[model samples]
Target: ASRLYTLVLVLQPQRVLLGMKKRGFGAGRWNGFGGKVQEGETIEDGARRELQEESGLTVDALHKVGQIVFEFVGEPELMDVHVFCTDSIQGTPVESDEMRPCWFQLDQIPFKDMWPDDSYWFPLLLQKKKFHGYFKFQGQDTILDYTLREVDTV
Candidate 1:
């Protein structure tokens, strides 16, 4: 069985917004804003809510860009993460208790400080291409195995 989660990327023409997770599951990592989907809430709604809660930015619209399944070596359940991207947004990015918001130039993405699987599909998103991926992790930062590909639609 798998737990459903939502991850959203706030993109601009020249830069992208990421959150340095301050605590909880992916703490110590720089990641897009997201979390578990609540009951009765749509994946898009969950993504929007998480982004706003973590970065204080409200999305005008969210485009479903990808979906990834993450399997940890020792965990019983996998994470089915729905990925979204949006450039139309409102409000200034303010840090929240769960994450510290930061903007990075497209070429300056801090991959070393992000999840290893991120480097695989992130470029596709930046290029406005849809993707689908599956990753098996050895631990927190190492990818034991994975597959990623650009797609026509998520």
Candidate 2:
């Protein structure tokens, strides 16, 4: 069965917060903070919980900026991921057992170390554009097909 997930990005004026996931799905990659959506929680609530769990930062408010469906060529199950962004937050971002937190200048985002799909929609996200997309991946490193478009509403 497919699963739902959330990814929250904390954006600052010229810098963004990211974490090097130390375990689980996207381990070894520098990416936003988030995880699976629990059954009883709203998507945004799950995003908030996961962000705090992974990076130790509490999201005060977040905007739902995008949604992406990810499919792996061989897996029957796919992931529907909701992407949220927030500049308003509480607490200093501290390293957690799941991830190591860091801030990167917007222009210097480490895309080379992130998921292959991230490069596709990230520009839209940074530009404050709402988007919807689908990605078919051969594996974590190779994208077989994808479609992304800016949308009037998400």
Candidate 3:
């Protein structure tokens, strides 16, 4: 079994918004905004909450683009991460205690500074393709193996 999580990427015009993690898991990494799903909230609600909390932005709705299962060696629980994208956002992306928001040009994503799995599925999401993925990691940056496939639905 896996712990539920959510990730939201703001895809607008020629750029995308990403957060620099300030601390905790994924610290020092550039990533979409998200974390563990809250106990009583729906998955999407959690996604919205995280984005607003971390980036000071809100979306009218989020498009479901993918789901990824991540396995880190020695960790008992897998990470079930739901990924989303949105072109519609309100409010500015202000810095938060947990994340520093920045926009990257679409063609210049800093993949080298992100979770390794993003290099794979991140492209698919950019193409507006739905997908499911699994990634096995030895540590923060080393991905031992991964599988990704496009689908009609995520």
Winner on lDDT (2 vs 3): 3
Best by lDDT: 3
lDDT of 2 by residue, 51-97 (tens): 98887788668999999999999799889999999988899999999
> Using Cα atoms with residue i matched to residue i, what is each candidate's TM-score against the true structure?
0.97, 0.97, 0.98
Which stretches in model 1 have alpha-carbon errors above 4 Å?
none
Query: In model 3, what lDDT does residue 54 have?
Result: 94
Q: Which is superior by lDDT, 1 or 3? A: 3
Where does model 3 exceed 4 Å of error?
none
Candidate order, TM-score descending: 3, 1, 2
Question: Against the true structure, whose TM-score is highest?
Answer: 3
RMSD over all Cα atoms, model 3: 0.7
TM-score of 3: 0.98
Off by over 4 Å in 2: none
Quantify all predictions' global Cα lDDT against the true fold: 0.92, 0.91, 0.94
The lDDT-based order of candidates, best leading, equals: 3, 1, 2
**Model 1: colliding residue pairs:** none
